[model samples]
Target: WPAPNEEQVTCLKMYFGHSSFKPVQWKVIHSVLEERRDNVAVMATGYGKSLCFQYPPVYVGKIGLVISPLISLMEDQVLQLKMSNIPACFLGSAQSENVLTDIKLGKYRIVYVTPEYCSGNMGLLQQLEADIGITLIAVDEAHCISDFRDSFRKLGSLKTALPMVPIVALTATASSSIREDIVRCLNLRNPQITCTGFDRPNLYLEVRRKTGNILQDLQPFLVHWEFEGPTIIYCPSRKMTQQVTGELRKLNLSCGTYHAGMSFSTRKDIHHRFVRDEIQCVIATIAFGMGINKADIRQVIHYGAPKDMESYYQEIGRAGRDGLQSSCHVLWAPADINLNRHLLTEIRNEKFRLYKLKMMAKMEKYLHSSRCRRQIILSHFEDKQSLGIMGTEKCCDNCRS
Candidate 1:
């Protein structure tokens, strides 16, 4: 579905302040522009997947609706659009009724909303349809529709509500299997999945097995990377987040804690402070990273093993988003595998529950694989040309020695 005019200079200069489409970006947007075409573009982080959704609507002369899963991510995009003098508004808990009425009237060219808002605000959508037709309904973190994913949301109702509208689901980390689940779950109509390179040569990857105290191993690492802009420590659970944040505080490090346990208001404030560079470090569970879009993050440490590789990849993908070199370290404890397994077992769907376990097992195997860590990772995402060896750039610990 190629657009009537493929010329991108005018819209690119206006909205994004750019002059070119970072490959695969134009095709996805073009696919959506043609009538009856739905698409799923799995582009790499920092390659600008947002542009596919942002530029298309303006070029075609229609409004855009963004069904974002996270409130913070939604607000951030809306804020950035407004900063660029684009007409965009967000509907969230903090938004006023007056603002919501403007969204209903389609006063803004771009409207960002959470899935909950999409499902519950049918009246607003219908009003929008009457005011200005919706050109695209894009899901930012498209993989979240998968039940096996850590970031999964029940977007079934969302799909049900907008059966007629074309959708473009976007994500940075989704395997072939998960991609299928995304299409099924979002009910995307004959989507054309476009996946770019999975390898991030600029990211230095390392997985260190635990020996003595985990905190002791991390303490020196933290002090050394202190000068790195905005480091995020990913802890497996709330308790671990508290412990790590507490320890960092005792050492007089400027850091904060984020977990599901924190009130939404508290977590939102932490997100703002961290993004504004008020805090140098943030120790958080899975809750914190998706809401972040900072570019200067130089380090991402897994305080414990993630439930699986998808979660790990998405967390690390948050770093190095500005095309800068970044280090990603996974500090693994033998026992964290069991903890991860137990969490996987908690999945409500019996079939997908086992599916989750299967993915977890792959994560365990990847960790123990003596071969190239990079190959083991890329192979999971079906990067067939994987080197079957470590980075020649010596970016990974396995390659460094």
Candidate 2:
């Protein structure tokens, strides 16, 4: 195998225990290494998306520029790369002048940053791109660029900042419309798009009507399941998260509560406890699940309905990542739909309100459909799956029970 850099090769062997790159990894690396083409990759969550840019930075002989959306994710990734003995650093809005000065000295091979910080200071990105000879530009969570996506954040300025560099976009979930928007937004050059199957065969999905008491229905599943893996309980509101956590605690279940309403320090502490396995489960809002790296989540129970199917799938995908037999169950109530409609009414912006309604309609279709769930999701991305080709009709919830 042609290694991108000797240092990265050594680190890859030591940390990942791999002597060579995977096929997709090699394909992406070769594009950056040889042709320097801007690329877009749609690998699943656990498919090693980081290696696409990490390997090329090894040979580019220049700093790698990574634009991430979350500060917590940026800090965690940089710390991991540093542990592998790869020189990595970050610049955030919260950082001091000394940190920024050190980063400008070209002392790190990878510079992690948030799009907000980069947009706040055009000169900073220009100087870093010029002084450090930025060899690659990577956009994590690239799906956020689509106006049709629920997570869309305007990133109109990124294109003009580094127009000449080879770019790579990464996301685990992107429908056909979102994919087209991503390519147009990033100006990718006839990019090679790769997608692993979105199906999580190990997950047993269930949607049950709430019996007016969600805790009573959830207790059986929580008590009888004999896995020591981490779990997540998602509620619709902050108050519901607290209520569920208190109820679970009364049942002698070890768990924590997390939501946007909590203080940053408190949320960090809860996150640490959950990551360290000191807490068996976290009762949280949807905000707490994105970008989390925990892989052994055994179950994800939803106490209330999510906004739509995309959000639902994304949250459920957080579990069973280790390919173990994890489970997901959602307690849906008629009242919850009215609550969600009221929440949508509060959006105020007409365009955003329409988008939210459209997404909710999609989710309703999924919930009402009798067809294969996996086929519905894949078909949204224009991926056609051959029936019986995988030798298992019982791979999904609709297929079994």
Candidate 3:
């Protein structure tokens, strides 16, 4: 069953222009296509995870439904598929009626939508099933389901609404507990878990002790690297995002700011400009997570400490996505720990608060540790075989020291 069949091979070559599948890619495709089983694929970013779900629709000659969280990400994927000569469309108000009619008529090989839209429009999905088969459901960035307030949590209703349709949850990072939460929330039945190595050899990781004036410390670095490819700076708060962007602008950097607080059209405009290289850098919050599909990002700088290893890893993984030597730097201060704890107070559930608090502690440890940063990340993800996987370059500040 693991072997690629004749139709699968032709689809892989004809549509995807690929003669082979990456290591775990074939297994994922087999699980959904052949075994028709639910799956959870935890591969690193840029590991061709999309190919696993994208292949089946073209192979089986049916449309696949992809529940994506970000409008930018949905548009990015749809554009890529269209360039490859595969028909794809995403749900948006501008073409809602026509798109619905097109989807019902089976005019698309893949249909991208949001979980929020799906929860309210379960009727449309049922209609799609009756009009034309929905090959499988792919939830991109599945870890969003772990948050109690996340709209992705509403995705559990998908299992209730389309019980027989095989669902595949995909993400770049998820801790053991978060993985468990994903499975339970989605009500996945004996999911075929496929996890790849978390280490990204081409990404250089560094943690810097923050000074009283963060802008002063970061300004010189940004000035020196201005000629590098596009960069992303992750701020802990929406206020901080604007502050960072303001400071970057003072340096005469071509940059933009992104946060959930902004209007939808503003963020969309900034995102498209950033992708098109009109903006050389973007100062954003976690709202920027997983939506980026840019391949040549040369740097990812966390303007402040991240809450946990999973978030940190996923954010940094955005850099060097094209397998080039890129850098990820985090500027951390002890005050960030207190800030994160204070922010965690927003959650009403004590259990969830403690879970986040514990995760935050690990991040503090990583910032203070003197060991190889890559190995520390690998250990956190339990990517056990660390004998020769550490970065060959000076991987982190400690390693350089």
Strongest candidate by TM-score:
3
Name the regions of candidate 2 deviating beyond 4 angstroms: 1-27, 40-44, 59-61, 92-105, 120-132, 141-161, 171-197, 224-228, 343-359, 369-371, 381-394
lDDT of 1 by residue, 27-119 (tens): 777677765467877766556677888887766657888876666567777788888877787777678989877766657878877677676
Residue 321 lDDT (model 3) = 67
* lDDT (CA) per prediction: 0.72, 0.71, 0.78
Q: How many backbone clashes does candidate 3 have?
A: 0
Q: Which residue pairs overlap in candidate 3's backbone?
A: none
RMSD of each: 3.9, 4.4, 3.2
Better of 1 and 2 by TM-score: 1
Please give the ranking of all candidate structures by lDDT, highest first, separated by commas: 3, 1, 2
Best-to-worst order by TM-score is: 3, 1, 2
Candidate 2 has its poorest 10 consecutive residues by lDDT at 143-152
Which candidate, 2 or 3, would have the higher lDDT against the true structure?
3
RMSD of 1: 3.9
**What C-alpha lDDT does candidate 3 achieve relative to the native structure?**
0.78
